[PDB]
Amino acid sequence: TVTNEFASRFRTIVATLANVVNERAVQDDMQKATRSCTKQWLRHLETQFD
């Protein structure tokens, strides 16, 4: 495969958690900067995992 199915699975997991944390952060009125930083952290986890 061009793409590792395990890594792609981790991408879907991180996508799900991303919209989860997002929904929470908008619920709790988080500053956009901190939100962007958690998202960046998740993308980093995806790369590391790949």
Partner: protein, 50 residues
């Protein structure tokens, strides 16, 4: 293609896409000679973004 290591975490990674596009315009021939090796990069970009 000279190898490009790109993970495509950040939107800034769009630079690499643009690099290719410019190369496609300035140099359609040479681009055509290496375009599959480019598609290997674009597939990372696409799987990650779309």
């Amino acid at each position: 293609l000279k190898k490009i290591a790109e993970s495509f975490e950040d939107p800034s990674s769009i630079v690499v896409v643009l690099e290719f596009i410019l190369f496609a315009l300035f140099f359609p021939t040479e681009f055509n000679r290496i375009k599959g090796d480019i598609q290997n990069v674009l597939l990372l970009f696409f799987s990650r973004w779309y």
